[PDB]
Homo-oligomer: A and B are copies of this chain.
Amino acid sequence: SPGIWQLDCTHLEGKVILVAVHVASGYIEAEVIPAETGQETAYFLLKLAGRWPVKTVHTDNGSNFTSTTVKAACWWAGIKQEDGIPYNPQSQGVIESMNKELKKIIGQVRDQAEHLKTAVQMAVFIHNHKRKGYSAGERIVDIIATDIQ
């Protein structure tokens, strides 16, 4: 569980927001891309795995599961590439609610930047710092530290 991440792709302003969620904590990283490609997804995962100990990634769709480039990135970075089948139906709703939350935050900050990518990074910040009382950022560090110890 400490090493399990889930990919998620959502759309806004004719662009794609690619999100990685640390399942156990709700911590996220995200980027804006023109379109979801294996190339972009592969690069995103390479970045993620250099920053956090990513053991397993549940891909967001079958195209990214199939993509040889995504498979190669997962090979390179020592990531177990898995499907994203919601054998637990609650997964679906959690991701959906997260996308709605993220879009809400983006709306709340949208006039504070010209570019969508800037607003998205503001949303990442706000999401990860929000106390629910610990924040997702606090939870991921505690979970991983406990695992190391």
Chain A interfacial positions (CB closer than 8 Å to B): 29, 43, 46-47, 49-53, 76-77, 112, 117-118, 121-122, 124-125, 128-129, 137-138, 141-142, 144-146, 148-149
* A31–B118 CA distance with the chains assembled, in angstroms: 16
Interface of chain A, helix or strand or loop or mixed? helix
- A selection of 12 A-B contacts at a CB cut-off of 8 Å is A46-B125, A47-B121, A47-B124, A50-B125, A50-B129, A51-B137, A52-B137, A138-B148, A141-B144, A142-B145, A142-B149, A145-B146
Q: What residue in chain B is nearest A54 (Cβ atoms)?
A: B125
Q: Which residues of B contact A148 (CB under 8 A)?
A: 138, 141-142
Of A46, A51, A122, A124, the most chain B CB neighbours within 10 A belong to A51
